[PDB]
Amino acid sequence: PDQICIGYHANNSTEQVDTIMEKNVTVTHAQDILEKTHNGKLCDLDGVKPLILRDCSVAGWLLGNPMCDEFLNVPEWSYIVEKINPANDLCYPGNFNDYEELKHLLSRINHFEKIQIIPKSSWSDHEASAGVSSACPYQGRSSFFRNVVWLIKKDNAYPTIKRSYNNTNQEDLLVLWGIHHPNDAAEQTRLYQNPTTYISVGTSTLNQRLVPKIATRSKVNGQSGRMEFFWTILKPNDAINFESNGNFIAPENAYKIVKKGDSTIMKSELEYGNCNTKCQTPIGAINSSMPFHNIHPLTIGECPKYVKSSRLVLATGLRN
Amino acid sequence: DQICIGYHANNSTEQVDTIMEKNVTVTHAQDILEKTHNGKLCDLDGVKPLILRDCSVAGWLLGNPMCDEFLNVPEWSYIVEKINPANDLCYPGNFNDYEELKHLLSRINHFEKIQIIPKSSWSDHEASAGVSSACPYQGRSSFFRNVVWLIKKDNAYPTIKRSYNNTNQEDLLVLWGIHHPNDAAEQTRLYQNPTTYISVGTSTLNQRLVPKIATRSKVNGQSGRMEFFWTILKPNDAINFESNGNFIAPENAYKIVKKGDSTIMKSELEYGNCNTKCQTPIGAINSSMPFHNIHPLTIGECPKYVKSSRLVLATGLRN
Amino acid sequence: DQICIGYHANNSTEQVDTIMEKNVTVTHAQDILEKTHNGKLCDLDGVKPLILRDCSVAGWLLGNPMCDEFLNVPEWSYIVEKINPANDLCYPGNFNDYEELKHLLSRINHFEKIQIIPKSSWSDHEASAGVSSACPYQGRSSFFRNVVWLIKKDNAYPTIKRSYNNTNQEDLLVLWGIHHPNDAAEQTRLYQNPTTYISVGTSTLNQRLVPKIATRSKVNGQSGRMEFFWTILKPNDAINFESNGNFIAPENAYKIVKKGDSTIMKSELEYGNCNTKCQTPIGAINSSMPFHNIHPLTIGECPKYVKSSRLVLATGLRN
Amino acid sequence: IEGGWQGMVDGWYGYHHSNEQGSGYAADKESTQKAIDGVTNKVNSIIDKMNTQFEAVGREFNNLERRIENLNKKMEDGFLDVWTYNAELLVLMENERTLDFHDSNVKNLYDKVRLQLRDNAKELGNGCFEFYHRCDNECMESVRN
Amino acid sequence: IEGGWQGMVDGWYGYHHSNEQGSGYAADKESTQKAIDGVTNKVNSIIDKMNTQFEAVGREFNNLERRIENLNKKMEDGFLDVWTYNAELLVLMENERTLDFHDSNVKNLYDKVRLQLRDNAKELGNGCFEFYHRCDNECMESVRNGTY
Amino acid sequence: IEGGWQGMVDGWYGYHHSNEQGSGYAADKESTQKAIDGVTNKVNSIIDKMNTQFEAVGREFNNLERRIENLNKKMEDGFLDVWTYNAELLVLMENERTLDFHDSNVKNLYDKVRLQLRDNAKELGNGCFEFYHRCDNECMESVRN
Ligand SMILES: *[C@@H]1O[C@H](CO)[C@@H](O)[C@H](O)[C@H]1NC(C)=O
Ligand SMILES: *[C@@H]1O[C@H](CO)[C@@H](O)[C@H](O)[C@H]1NC(C)=O
Ligand SMILES: *[C@@H]1O[C@H](CO)[C@@H](O)[C@H](O)[C@H]1NC(C)=O
Ligand SMILES: *[C@@H]1O[C@H](CO)[C@@H](O)[C@H](O)[C@H]1NC(C)=O
């Protein structure tokens, strides 16, 4: 009549897990290890506010599109946020040469310090103030990129330009310039006098010679002319030498690279959220002790490990 | 009175593998790897592929006279090109950004070819003398169908200024070229003007080409070269050509009518008059297996490729 | 009377890991990860590598006077170049498609250098004045060995028209360049003609170069630049140069004599007078292990690389 | 057991009884039913598990794009090797688990009968049990049921 | 066993005794203590094992870089699939090992008690033992304490 | 069992007998022979299984090829991590299977002797058996054989 029995625990839990052998197996206790929730906004990363470009593109920012005056001298940033299709890009139509490569450098950079290298008042024999277009409006008038100068002829003359800037700073220097491709020979001589023109640019590594490309093009922002922009990193102690007899979009301001580090250029339609986080995705921030998450593959910060799984649950107790 | 526990057995010789053991014979074994294909190129879910046979993509698009079969092709499921097509650029030269074009083409299922610049449009230039023995057609010198080799008329080549506005709803693939002659004599013989250029503009394109006179080796009996360019002219944009020589003008262009999953398959096989759910360049597959090892590059609802020669699951007990 | 079942044991302290358990002591344990290398660069299966020492691939191929050691190298197993070789382009400039050339070079085991255009061939141009203090040799201004910096003779630079037909059975690597001067004065001083060009044609190549006059920073005391180009001239094809200035003509070219598995290894080590089956840039490996963690980039019959610090199999029972 | 019997082809597992009335085989339908469902469940899960593996794409490069061509080739071959390893390794795991699952069911059926008649029977050793109190066809079924 | 008992909520494994005095549940603290440590050790190791997996990076390509853009996309999706497979498969391996680990502890506890009273008890079959000599509350503890 | 015996150094598994004549160790050659072959088979299969893993290649990019350089680096590191995971995980699977394989052989040897003398012996519990009818050296061998 006296007896003893061996057994195990049970309860009224309905939580289930999977196994290689079996699926849909109910257990007493189960530990979820996948984070599925984000806060839905863009935040500071470990107390450092990101650069939110809003309606401007990286190009518009760096060149100084008049619509982007907000970003003339930005503070240090943790990451950069650009919309999928920013409205304020190259106000005057054209292209940025090696633009994706520049953006890659920018993802390694945390802070610029903008400095003027060629004052606008420096141009004695050329007109520096007439270089404006209705394609780049500012407060209801024709304007132009802030950081570069569209020089044109003065007194029906465009003498050959020969300018050098020696980077006497300790920082690497991002320098930008451009060339104007006019619509026709008439426009060419109207603006620059000389019919056949060129732009030479030299550094210790750079050896450029550009020639304008006159052609009939479709109007973009009411312009059939085009402007093509170029860039380079002028190392400390090197010099850059410009020479031109027309179509030159000269540098005015350049960017000292002040801080490097882990950064990214995030594509997102979200705005600044007035939050702080350890882990950002383009779709929202994450505060989680979970080892995995499935919010978004592209992230920055101390984050959990991304997976494509919808569900991920560990067994801790026994089966029922 | 007694009861005993036991298990099944039979005379099967089928064997399987294990992490512990190899060559282990069992009663039943389920093969899950497909090793057999039908050995020919087929329709993909009832849609016939474009088999280029001896022509290359370039030869097709430009209209090499040997490729007249493909002047107006119907919708296709995938494209098949040989490893080294015989009929390419009959007149020697190159196609600019050719691999990029082929990549677009792998996203496209149907073109509709339209004429944008009639050959009769050229009043002050000769449109019909632009032919070469490098591009024979029925035993006479011919040229690419879809572009026009303009030359001087009455010892004159006046500056050309032509625009075409894409009034269609479709993206438009437009093609043109430049002729690089052998010498200054040839230059003036064909185009009169010694120093020449070609300007091409759209809302996105800003081109200015200049010929490159040079002494080159003969290819298909020609030391001259022709370099071809392309662009996608978006609906409502216009393309503006200007030139005083060496211009290979567009005649026909391609309206992009349908996009989707397609591929450019490299294969030496011909059309097989079959239909399949899954094609490889080496043959089609009709299989309920989860895996296969025929070929990595496939298109359609296919099993999962692996490099394994053998793959067999255990279903029964061991001997 | 009695009988008992038991198992082996000993005084070993070697431990292994398990998915369930960590730090588990067993009787015997088989290490399968190689952690040791010999620390030097060796022959690969009896074939000595090409150690460039202070020279770069460019310096070697063009014939930088500091690299005279490598004027005619024997067959090699692999190539070793330092992270930042001192002897590169002595005269400042760049090598066009240099990384692509280096990729070809990693498929090549032996060149045979031949002269294709003798330096005495230039009757109407000066072939011997083309030298610079940027390229010193034994305390005097010199220049790249395998190419020739032609300059004007008797205040004249007549148009050059030279062809070389590759009559050899081997593919031929040919090299040439263009000189970009500092100013119009330098241009006319050296080449007489103010506006100049270089045309180069093969069956595949159609080049036209124009110098780029500009004010540049001094590199090795030169503000001028030289830009180098290359091509593989197939057996029976010909290469045709034409120029009226700024031409750096070929003198020597390289016959591709043997192809095979090779690599361009980046390493600061010197030749070690050893032989091995497996080389890394950090040292050679002689090991029967299936894994190793020395360095990911290797050549030869090597074990399989992993990032693991430790890797130990259980052979026999726990204690 | 010494070995398996070719005789029974009814189910996978089963009993054989000797009795004063007669003798014959009898497959355990409860054990065979749960076994056939178990193996069929796995063979389907292996199909679903691998269904999001790498799909290779033809790409074309020119003769000055040799580095990227090589990168592309190594990349596609890399994944194809990775998933071929996962496939091969998965099959050896599924197979090993199948054979151990069968040997598990044999022992679990021997222990189930032994637990059902503790003091009323004698375990011989070769996978058989001798009843102490005599057991007719109805009791045989009662042990099976 | 036929099934598990809702009764005991002390530990995971345990005993239930019937006796002349009374009857009640009693959890094995020695068995439960080693079990709680074992599962907590595993859940942490799965976190550490996957921490060197692939981290994807935004890259940008222009409209004449379509081939490389595609290569990049396929590459990143490739690894994300690979590690998602490793993650999913690892969880099914950890789960399977958890449930077999529990069934292992039940049998090991049944064999421990059976070995402690060989000839002095009768194993019924349903996971219980009938004592031959009657056993009061102190003996029950003595069977449980591991000193019977 | 309480533990393993340092005494026997003949084989991996074996018997120890107490007897009116004397006492000594005795390794099971049949069990040890199949065990030595089993482990040697595995250690070789782990070598063959990983032999088609990723092989990394030096590539060079210029300073305006930074995006592809990065892609290349991430790709090669990606596979090297993937295969390092497969290698590490495979070793823990092989190790675990080795130790369970040994504990399997001990129990299978204890059950083999127990099945050979059912009613003629008494199982103590600590991994030993007491004969009811006395058993000399020849019978010990007969139990071993
Ligand atoms: C496995 O079986 C095949 C026969 O189909 C045989 O060729 C192979 O050698 C066997 N494997 C081993 C390790 O013996
Ligand atoms: C093309 O034609 C349409 C219809 O006349 C017009 O709206 C559009 O502006 C034209 N575009 C160009 C670039 O000429
Ligand atoms: C720039 O300035 C420094 C400091 O005087 C000088 O040494 C250097 O030569 C200059 N750079 C160039 C390219 O002339
Ligand atoms: C080069 O020389 C061979 C042999 O004389 C000749 O047959 C061949 O046509 C030549 N190649 C070229 C490109 O002229």
From TrEMBL, chains D, F:
<comment type="function">
    <text>Binds to sialic acid-containing receptors on the cell surface, bringing about the attachment of the virus particle to the cell. This attachment induces virion internalization of about two third of the virus particles through clathrin-dependent endocytosis and about one third through a clathrin- and caveolin-independent pathway. Plays a major role in the determination of host range restriction and virulence. Class I viral fusion protein.</text>
</comment>
<protein>
    <recommendedName>
        <fullName>Hemagglutinin</fullName>
    </recommendedName>
</protein>
<comment type="subunit">
    <text>Homotrimer of disulfide-linked HA1-HA2.</text>
</comment>
<feature type="disulfide bond">
    <location>
        <begin position="135"/>
        <end position="139"/>
    </location>
</feature>
<feature type="coiled-coil region">
    <location>
        <begin position="47"/>
        <end position="81"/>
    </location>
</feature>
<comment type="similarity">
    <text>Belongs to the influenza viruses hemagglutinin family.</text>
</comment>
<comment type="function">
    <text>Binds to sialic acid-containing receptors on the cell surface, bringing about the attachment of the virus particle to the cell. This attachment induces virion internalization either through clathrin-dependent endocytosis or through clathrin- and caveolin-independent pathway. Plays a major role in the determination of host range restriction and virulence. Class I viral fusion protein. Responsible for penetration of the virus into the cell cytoplasm by mediating the fusion of the membrane of the endocytosed virus particle with the endosomal membrane.</text>
</comment>
